[PDB]
């Protein structure tokens, strides 16, 4: 009868809907990462709360306990692959301390803006939606794509992009100008 595949929410409403400083901080983050909605930042901090809860539960467990010495490096290696923690990091206190902008730095639009390609973060957003960039052998049109610690070396333009060597420019303009040229000649 009912389908057997699950589904879950990815965002949580903030409650206390009209905190002035919370609204200001949200607007700052929205503007300086160029993302369309505060639902997106709600998703990011929902994920952040998930990781943080796992980390603090692990910290409650005593050292060299089996659950900790399995899940702790599981989570730590996941964070390292995501690029959320550096090499100088080795413990769980740092994954407790990682923050919202540090999470937001890994979005596709922020990474492509940082690498160049697009001159504004909103330009990067629209370009990703315009499907002109490639994470390597695979094109992505999802701005919320989280780049891992190896793919940033090979984010670049998609091979089908006009900026990637495809169809040069406006075919309408080119055809019109060539018709004018052939008529004049």
């Amino acid at each position: 009868p009912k389908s057997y595949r699950n589904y879950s929410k990815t965002a949580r409403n903030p409650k206390r809907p009209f905190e002035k400083e919370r609204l200001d901080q949200e607007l700052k983050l929205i503007g300086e990462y160029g993302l369309k909605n505060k639902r997106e930042i709600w998703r990011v901090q929902y994920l952040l709360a998930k990781i943080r809860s796992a980390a603090r539960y692990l910290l409650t467990l005593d050292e060299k306990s089996s659950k900790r010495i399995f899940q702790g490096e599981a989570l730590l290696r996941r964070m390292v692959r995501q690029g959320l923690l550096g090499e100088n990091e080795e413990k769980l206190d740092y994954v407790l301390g990682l923050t919202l902008p540090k999470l937001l730095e890994r979005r596709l639009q922020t990474k492509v803006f940082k690498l160049g390609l697009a001159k504004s973060v909103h330009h990067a957003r629209v370009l990703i939606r315009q499907r002109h960039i490639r994470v390597g052998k695979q094109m992505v049109d999802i701005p919320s794509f989280l780049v891992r610690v190896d793919s940033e070396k090979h984010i670049d333009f998609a091979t089908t992009s006009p900026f990637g060597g495809a169809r040069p420019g406006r075919v309408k303009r080119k055809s019109l100008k060539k018709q004018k040229e052939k008529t004049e000649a």
Binding site: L27, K28, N37, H122
Partner: peptide
């Protein structure tokens, strides 16, 4: 509207 709407009221 959209992301552009947030753009101007941010900047």
């Amino acid at each position: 509207t959209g992301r552009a709407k947030k753009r101007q009221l941010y900047n």
